[PDB]
Design a protein around this ligand. Sequence first.
Ligand SMILES: Nc1ncnc2c1ncn2[C@@H]1O[C@H](COP(=O)(O)OP(=O)(O)O)[C@@H](O)[C@H]1O
Ligand SMILES: [Mg+2]
Lengths: 97, 96, 52, 205, 195, 185, 138, 584, 109, 50, 47, 170, 12
Amino acid sequence: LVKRHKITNNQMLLMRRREPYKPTMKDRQEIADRAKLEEFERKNADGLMFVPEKALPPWQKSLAHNAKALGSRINFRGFRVRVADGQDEPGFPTPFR
Amino acid sequence: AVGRQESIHNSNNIRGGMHSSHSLDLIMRQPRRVKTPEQLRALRDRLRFIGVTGPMPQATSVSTKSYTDTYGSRLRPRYPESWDTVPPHQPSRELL
Amino acid sequence: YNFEEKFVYFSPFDYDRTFALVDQCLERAETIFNEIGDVEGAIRVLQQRKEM
Amino acid sequence: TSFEDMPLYPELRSALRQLRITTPSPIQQSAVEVIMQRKDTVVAAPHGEGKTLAYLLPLYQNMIKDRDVYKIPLRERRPRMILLAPTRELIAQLHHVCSVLGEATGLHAISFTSRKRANHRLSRLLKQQLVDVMIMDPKIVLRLIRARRVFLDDLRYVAVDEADGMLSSQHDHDAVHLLMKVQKRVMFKHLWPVQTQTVFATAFI
Amino acid sequence: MAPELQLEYMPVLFTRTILGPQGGFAGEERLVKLEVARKYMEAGHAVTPTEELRRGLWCYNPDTDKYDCFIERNEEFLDFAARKRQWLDVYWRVNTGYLLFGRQSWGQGFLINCPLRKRDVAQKLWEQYKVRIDPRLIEFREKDRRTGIQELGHNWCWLYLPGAEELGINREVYDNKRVKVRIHVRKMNSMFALY
Amino acid sequence: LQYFVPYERDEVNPVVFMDVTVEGDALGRVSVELFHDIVPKTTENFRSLCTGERGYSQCPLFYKGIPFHRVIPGFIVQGGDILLKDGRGNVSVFGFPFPDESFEGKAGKHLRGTVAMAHSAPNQNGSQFFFNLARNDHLDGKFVVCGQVIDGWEVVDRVAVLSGSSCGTPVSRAWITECGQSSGD
Amino acid sequence: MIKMGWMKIGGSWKYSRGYNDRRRVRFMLAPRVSAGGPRNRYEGKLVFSPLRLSKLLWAIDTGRINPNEVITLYHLRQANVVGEREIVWPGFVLISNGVRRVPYPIHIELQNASAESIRLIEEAGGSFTCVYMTHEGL
Amino acid sequence: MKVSSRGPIVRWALSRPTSGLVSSPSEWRCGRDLSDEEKHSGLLLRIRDICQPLAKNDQLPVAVVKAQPSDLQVNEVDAVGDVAALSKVVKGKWRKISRQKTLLIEDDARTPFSDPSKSFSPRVQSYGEYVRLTGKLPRDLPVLRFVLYRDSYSLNSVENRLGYVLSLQPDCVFLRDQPGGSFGCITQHGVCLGVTKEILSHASRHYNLHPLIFEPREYFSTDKLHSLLQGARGHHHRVLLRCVEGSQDTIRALLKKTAERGFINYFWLDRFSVGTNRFFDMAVLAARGDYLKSIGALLHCVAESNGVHYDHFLKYLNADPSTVPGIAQTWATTAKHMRSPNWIVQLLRGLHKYHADAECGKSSYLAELWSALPMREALRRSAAEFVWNAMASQRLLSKGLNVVEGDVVRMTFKITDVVLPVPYGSVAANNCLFPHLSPLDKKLYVEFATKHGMSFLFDEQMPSPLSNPLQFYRHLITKPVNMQVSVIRDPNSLTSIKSDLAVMQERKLVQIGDIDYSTRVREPCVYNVSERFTEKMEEILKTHRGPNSVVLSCYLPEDSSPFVMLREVFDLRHASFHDLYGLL
Amino acid sequence: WLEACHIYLTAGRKLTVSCAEALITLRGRCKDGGVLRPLDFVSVTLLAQLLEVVSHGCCSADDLVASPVAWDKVRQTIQGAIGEDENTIQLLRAGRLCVADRQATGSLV
Amino acid sequence: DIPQVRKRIWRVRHIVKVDVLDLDEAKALIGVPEHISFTDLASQLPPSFG
Amino acid sequence: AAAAAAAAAAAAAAAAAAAAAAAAAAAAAAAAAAAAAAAAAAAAAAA
Amino acid sequence: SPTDVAANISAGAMPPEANVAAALPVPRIQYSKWNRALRSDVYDELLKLPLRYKLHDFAKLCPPQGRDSAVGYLPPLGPADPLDTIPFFVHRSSNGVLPGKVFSMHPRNLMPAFYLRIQQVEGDMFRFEEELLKIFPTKKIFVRSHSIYVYNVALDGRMVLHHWLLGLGF
Amino acid sequence: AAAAAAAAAAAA
Ligand SMILES: Nc1ncnc2c1ncn2[C@@H]1O[C@H](COP(=O)(O)OP(=O)(O)O)[C@@H](O)[C@H]1O
Ligand SMILES: [Mg+2]
């Protein structure tokens, strides 16, 4: 059904849209998409930070830890396991790289 | 009133008949009562603010006390609540 | 939303002017006691204000 | 309705004279203007109106403009243009069509496909000859990017010859991943502003 | 004037008159974008500036249809050429355009509620073509002399351009004393359609 | 005229510095020692507002870039209204206007270089403060004293002279450009 | 009602059909890693319930567990530091969650323990024995 | 009793520099002018002040310097004469020790697992394990000579990277400090012990906006270690000033007069930090024994340099004496987690122990911590250099350009030959031939040292560091051997100069002799600088109406900051100044 | 190659036409030099010295470093050096032309 | 009367009728002394009005 | 919400400011070409 | 802390060695009902906050190094100020854990909105409510004869509440 | 000996 509303004057009777100052559905989608794109670009303004092992999502953290388990128990620098699930290479130099 | 953009319409209408803003036009026609910046500064210095947040000078007279000091901030006079004279309500709401 | 109605608060200082008057009178009495140097009077008057 | 009306360098005019192109196809007429205006573009044509030239010649004009007017330097593993095509035969054809333009305009274009020692051959090519254009499959381009054999620091043009297949699952979305990496590079601020543009030539939409 | 703007532009001397926004008058030295500058230079309509060219330049005379009219590029000649090119530019902008108007027409109807006036035509000319003109110059047709345009679809009026006789635009245009402003009235959105 | 520090400096007490700029013209730097032994709550509030440690609750809790909305040539120099820089709203780092702690001795006497926290109610402190400019007997016991001034008193006096008026409203804009914490000096 | 929220029992049923549809009551593209699936609890698998070393130390400090005796799963159950819900075979595994030191020696007998927890116990001076048991023994 | 300092705590950066504008202070954003800091550090006098009867009668032209790391480039020139140039790039080699692990996953889902013909395909979990290829180190030639090009890394950061990547100790690597701020690109020779080419190359990092690249050249025997460690005999400096007022003619005239007349060879602020308390202040505090205040000032400078340290320092200062041990513990843990240098991590740990345990709650523990601190020699050298700056300023004030019975270099001597001693301990105070002048002499040196609290550098001696050996005789004024200048018009300051790594990437060779306008200098265009750089420089451009950008390449004889010469010529402001914070 | 050039062009050690030709050939068959599809100024100066030595008394190092035409004249004069030497001379001439194109630079010695 | 308000009124000039009042005219309309300033009045009036 | 509101304001400004665009033949907006002001046949009187 | 390590590294202030700091928080011993890890910064903030009741010394709150415990269990202390009387009394559970327990608004839907539910408060529930108003000014607080609900609060708020209670005699 | 007075001493 249509959401009826308590009126405060005949202007509300003549009114069709409850919020005239609000963009229509298509303009809302356009504005939301533009805002999300701008926020994403602002987030990505800096390079892709190479987060450590402990900061990876739950489905990569344990795999990386198991891959590098032996090196953790036997400590010697220069040991890196070339896992597959790690973060993808960005392609350009970054401040964190 | 010197140098108006509505001079043509004023001449066309007001000089023939009175307008709702006749009193405003008379006030604008009359010269300003603050002649000089020195006079303006003197009047501004004489001006006094009561609701201001900060402190107020009291060198004028030690015996003179402020209403807030005498009765406190939470207390207000029992204003005569009548149609003709309606006072502010709920100073607690007024604060913020 | 509109949950300020679940916490609507009405100040006794505004909805009971006698309470505000007596609170101010006790504050002035405490100030007078402090000026005089009395201690027991200030203690009792402040305690009565707190109880009110 | 004329290459003469189109603003083209004498080198490009000589290149098209060598190619025997004299009258622009409607697709070229519509696409050269926009690609010169430097906007991401989707060219569509019914299989043989000249999409290859439509999306190559303006891109070469832009590359020449960058190299001469803007004097953007050429680095070793940072090509200006990445061209994508699915099949090895099409890769070779695009390599030929780009080599003629390179010989005409002083630019350089390479192309690589599967061989005996693919990694060794490709790395040797990259080490030996720095290039302006690379015509290669998106899978190999992604391999290079992930092995940091190539970089998007100076990349300014991306061209896709079969956008349908390239962006469909028929080719594993490798082109889509490469384009997302390009978008990330464009978003990146600490490097010089490169307004990388993408051209998609597609006989079907 | 900035270094980047100068890098993307290039100075050029106009051998003849071109009325486009990137054009100029004969003997004009102007900074023009590289693309159209090269276009003109290869077509023969402009040349790279030089000291000899600045002191004096050869130009195109339509009487013989050859670049064989030598003229000195002095201040008075530059001023006159600027004025003549401004007149021709106004004429060309008016003639090679289609003055859009957005008006209200209740229901379907056949004409607009509020007829167009010389002030409205002048304001639209300024808005679109960036040309300032006295409204008295605009003159409506016989059908539109009394009540303005007052009709949808294709409409046109006359715009008089004085000074053509002085400047010498007798044979460079169709009629040197009149310009046909071609208008198109239409129903547009609420925001675009005023009055 | 000569300036003498009212009380004795204490190494334990925090020090807070602020630079004052008038009409884009820098004047110097004022250092304030906060009486942390007698009014810890107000001291912490003032220090946090000057340093900007806390984030935002209703407005940037930071005295940087805030004007002195109320100046008098020889009474006070007031300012620091973080929320409404005009000088109307009063805010605290704690989130609510906290009450007066103590007016006993050091925190109850107003002197020349003394600093205090202005309040719109006799028990609602906030962000805006004011430096005294002379012995203000009528202010003793009414406004909490937060600390004293060690350096920059000449800057404070010059600010008062430049943008002062018996009306209280400043003549020329004067504000805080860079404020923060310091060490004992 | 699905598309209109809560409607009165009075009426207005015409614009509600999904409500009645619900009242009347992708995996194919993903591969199977193993026959039993990931993290399959096949019979005989050693899936120990966690036992926080911090929890055990807190119990000892409060006084529900006597340090003077060799702690066992039976002692933990009787002290009520663990519930019957988490007593499934093979039993408990000691985990050093947020514990850096054990101030006093502790003698424990659990069915498994982490290397860090064993190291902490040994360094403190106590002892640990991994008393792995069958169902009958437990 | 908590540590304390004297000056205000100003955080140069922002809590969140998202708009490119890094400096928090408004004046620092518009451009940092270190005139007051230089005056307090000893650079009191100017050659133009000496010449003109009045001082600062005409305001010097305003300029902004090293707003981009590529702007300043420094190349070392060793006593042998060979210049430090980026020849070729070698990457760290790895050896694969394990085989890639694969797992068989069902190829199709319709066919049941019970079917013997079930099809499985492999998927890679780990491509393998790799280990850095430690080469073979001959026992006859343990010393390795290399060249290091660092974009914006401090020498301390480079040493820390070598230590943690390679697991070596700081005494195994000898890198001579290079004049000029560390922010700009710096290429210098270096000597290391017990390291191999492969691992020394592994120590680099090629895929960062700020490249730190190493490359060995040849092995050498331990006999020639001293010869290799001998101080460099030249520095080629390439500088780019962005916004300079005036015109090409007047700028060139100013530079011509500066080159002809030389410039004073002051110890620029690269030796003593720009913070409120300087290295020599810390040194004098330690010498007089107020180790508490010395460590407080050290932490103060570290806090000013680093944001997180600034966050924790204020918490420590304002912490209640009951909770201060926990605040110190949290600070130490945060430093360890963010992987701050080991010396500062240990200092914070010791501070926490001092506040927690009553055993360590005494000045003896603080003295032990300061002794363990490895910066003491650097602070003492900074104090000696400050004293030398003050004495040189006094010498110029008293005598002036003319030379009268003054010390000269033993190859009528000239002012260029005139030299003054820098007292690096009692050994220097004795051996060096101080000038024999009635107003200025060893007596005035000692008086100044005593009144400023630097009496230790005369009472006792200080060892000469092996990395950068001491130079007791430092000339009074110096004249660039070569000096080339170019001026361009760029009101929006989009000009840039290519770096050595950029030239190498484009495959051309690197030339250090002179400014390469065709290759190194890039014409002004939007595609020359990053968008972050434009956002950072817009604030400067809103203040400094400098239409001229100056690209200069000069040579300096032994050790001199080109910023000293540029200060004597113009009034310079440093958009990037964090590099001057030597510690951390 | 650079070390050999230094030790030979050293004033004390006299050179010969054959040695200069050998150095030219080595520079042609160098490896770590710049791409040759300009050239480094140091190598250009050394090669100009070698060419003026080869010219048998026609000392024109200044002409070679100043004007590109001198490079063409020396290429015509020399006959023995053929092959990669032609490309080397061409690229050196291009590099020196580019260097001389700039006059805004001022050597404020 | 500021650029933003002028932009808005220009945008909606076909739904809005505008009247102008100089500061002097507004001050006379409200009836306050000429020496008092609207800035002072604004500073005095409460911020939590509506 | 700030980003969405800013985007909405920008969209409204863009869709409400440029009521009409100069004819492409006179000057191509997409090619960055712009038309200057021709006040030759203008008047100064307030008509 | 106000610093953004990632932003500082991007700008160039901090070195690129703080990637771990930018990604994940500093290691600690998380406060759990089986481990009373007392955060000195949290307790210092509680001390600085203008509360009406005096708090105990953090040294007293921390156990020795009454017996030492790694988890950090200590019996409840007394009021800091004997003269003053606390209007509310808080009881500990059989395990000594404090009342604060965090729940969820719609556990069935796994809604990420949580609220703290304090219980075992026997004295002036409303004075306890007022103290909670001072501590969490912006949160919605409701009082009942058996419990006090603080909405939009989570494990961090439970930790802060437990620190405040331990600072008090309880 | 004016530098001694010109450069004031500081003890951080
Ligand atoms: N203006 C043109 N005139 C004549 N031939 C052209 C023209 N443009 C492209 N071609 C030729 O027509 C053929 C098809 O061109 P091509 O670009 O490969 O087709 P498609 O658009 O499907 O990719 C080729 O032989 C090409 O050389
Ligand atoms: Mg094709």
